[PDB]
Amino acid sequence: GDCRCLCRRGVCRCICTR
Numbered sequence: 513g514d515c516r517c518l519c520r521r522g523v524c525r526c527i528c529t530r
Contacts (some may be wrong), residue, residue, distance in 0.1 A: 515528040 513528065513530050515526065517524060517526040519525065
């Protein structure tokens with residue numbers, strides 16, 4: 513239920529979990 517954005521290898525992923 514908590515959203516978090518993270519970037520890896522210059523690719524940004526905004527994902528939500530729990």
